[PDB]
Design a protein around this ligand. Sequence first.
Ligand SMILES: [Zn+2]
Lengths: 193, 50, 192, 263
Amino acid sequence: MGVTCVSQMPVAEGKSVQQTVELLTRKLEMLGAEKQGTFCVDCETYHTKLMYVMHNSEYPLSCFALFENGPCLIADTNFDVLMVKLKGFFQSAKASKIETRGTRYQYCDFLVKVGTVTMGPSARGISVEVEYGPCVVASDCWSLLLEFLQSFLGSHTPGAPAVFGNRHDAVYGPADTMVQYMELFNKIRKQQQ
Amino acid sequence: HKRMRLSGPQAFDKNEINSLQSSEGLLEKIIKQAKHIFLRSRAAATIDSL
Amino acid sequence: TINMMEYLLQGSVLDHSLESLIHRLRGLCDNMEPETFLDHEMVFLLKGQQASPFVLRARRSMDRAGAPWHLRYLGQPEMGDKNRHALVRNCVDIATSENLTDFLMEMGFRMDHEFVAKGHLFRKGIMKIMVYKIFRILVPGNTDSTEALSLSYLVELSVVAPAGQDMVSDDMKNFAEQLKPLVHLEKIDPKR
Amino acid sequence: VSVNLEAFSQAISAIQALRSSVSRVFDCLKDGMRNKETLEGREKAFIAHFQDNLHSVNRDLNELERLSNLVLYSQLLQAYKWSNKLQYHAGLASGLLNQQSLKRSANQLVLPPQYVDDVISRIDRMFPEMSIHLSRPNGTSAMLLVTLGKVLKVIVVMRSLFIDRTIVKGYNENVYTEDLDIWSKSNYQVFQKVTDHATTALLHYQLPQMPDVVVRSFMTWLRSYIKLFQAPCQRCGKFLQDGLPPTWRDFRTLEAFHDTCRQ
Ligand SMILES: [Zn+2]
C-alpha cells in the first residue's frame, strides 16, 4: 500500500479526448519516465443501496467490492464468479459500467497513470493517479504528492483527497485507492455535458 | 501455498505474486553461486597482491 | 472460468477408536506432520423473494493467526450414476478480508447457525481427509464456551476437482474402502 | 521553571541597558559638537549620534515593559555551586581536548553476550519511536530488527558489540520475520540509497576503543530518518530530484540533503 492521489484533468480547448492523453503522456515521458507495462481498471455496478466492484490490473488476482461509505472487501477473482452465480438473485443495473485504460509511466519510485474513463464505448474525461510505494505513511506524504503534481500536472492539481480524511497514523490501504476511484467514477458518470 | 492464500485479502502487487511463484532451476542457481565464488576469490587475490 | 465440483463422502468415528483411525490415516496418507486445525464457521442465508435462500458458508481460522476468512458456495447435489458412489456439488472458493461479516450483513445476508470444528487434517494426492468434532456454540456471540454436538467425529473425504474428465470418484472409493473396516465412509444424502 | 529564569536574567540586563543608554544621551550632550572638518558634517554628526542615543533609550525602555509580561548550611550551597562549576568546566575541557587528539598510534575480540544485550536494551529504552528486536539465529553474532515508525525497518548485523552490515527495508515490505532475512534488497531505489548511506554512516561512526557510543550515534542518526518524505532538501529546497526524496543527513548536523547535493 503506497499513498496515491487520483484526479480528473479536463481536455480543454478543442483538444479531442484522445489528443489530450497523447499530449499529457508525452509530457510525462518528458520527465525521464519509462513505461512499465499497461494498466486496466474495469468497474461494474449494482443498484443494491448501490454495490460497486472494481479491479485494477496492478493487482493481478484481487477484485474489490465497495459499498459506498460501507466497508470494502478485497477478495479473490472467484468473487466475480460468485457474483455471476447469484446474478439471477442479484440486481444488475443498466450499462453503468465505467473503465479507465491508459499507459503506466515510472519516474524513480513514483508510478503515474493517466487514463480516459471511457464510458461504455465513448470516452469522456481523464483520471490521473500518482502512487508512492516507499511511502507507507499517508496524510502527510501529501506534501510529496503535491510537489510532484505541480511539477507535471501544473494547473488543475488536486488539493488532496478526503480518503486521507481525519489526521491519523493509520496506514494507507488498497481500499483507499479504490474509494478515490469510486468517487472519481461517480463524478464522470454524472458530470454530463 | 499459504502466501498465495494471503495474496487475496492482504492484497499483493505483481512483484510479490511473481516472487512467490518463480520459475528458476538448479543449474541457474549453481552457476550464480560458482560465479560469486570466483568473483570473491579474484578480489581476494587482487588485494593480496596489492 | 471452469466451475469446481466437490466430491464428498461422509462417515462417523466414535471417540474411543479415534486413536486407531488417526494412526491408520497417517500411514496411508502422504508423510506430512498433522495440521491440528481449529476453526469457526457461520452460515449466512439470503431471504429473498425466491423461496430457496442462497447459503454462503464463511470460515475464520482462530488457531492460524494472519490467515484470511474463506467464503464458499455449495451447489445442489448432482449425484446420478450409482457406480460413482460419491456426492457431487458445485463449489466456488473465495478468500475474503476480515471485514467479511459486515459486508455480508449490509448486503442483506443473515447469520443463521454457527459451529466450531476442531480436529486433524491429512491429505493423499488431491484427496483431503478431515477428521473433526463439531461443537455447538451457545451465547449470541463468542467462542470461549462450546458443548460437544456428539461424542463421535465426522470424517469427510473431499476433492476439489477441476470438473475435467472423471474417475475422480473411483480413486476416492478405493481410498474409502481401506478405512471401511475401521469406519464406513459412505455418501449420506443431506436430506434427513 | 527555566523559562522564568531566562526572562529574569534578560530583564536584569535590560535595566542595566536603560540606565547606561540614558547616561549616554546626557554624557554625549555635555561634550557637545566636534569640528568634523565641515559645517554640514559637524551638524549631521551631532544630530545622528543624539538621535541614535535617544532611540536606544526608547528601545531599552520598551524591552523592559515587554519583559514584564513574560516574567553548616552555606557550605551546602557552596558544594552545589562547585559541583555545577566542575561539571561545566570538565565537560568543556573534555570536548575541547578530545576534539584535538595528539595520539598517533596504538603500539608504543571477546565480549559477554549479556553485556551486549544490556547495551541494546539501554539504547532501546531511549528513542521511544524506535523498537529494536534482539535475536541470535546464527551464533553469538546478534541481528537487530529496528522498526522506525511506519517508515523504516533496518536490519543491523552485529558480529560483536560492533556494527557490520545494515540493510534498511520498507515497513510494508517483508523481512520474512523468521529464519531473519539477512541477505536481500528493498526493491525500492530510495531504500537502497538509504542502505548505502547507512553503510556510509557505519564507516563514519567508528570509535576505536569504546563500542557503545558508536551504536548510540548510529541509532541517533537512524532516528533522523523519521522525517523522511516530510522534509525539504537544505540546498535546493526541492522534495524530489529524479523521483527521490532527500536521502542524506549530515553527520554532526541532522539535516536533510539529496546525495547529489552532497551537503
Ligand atoms: Zn537537493
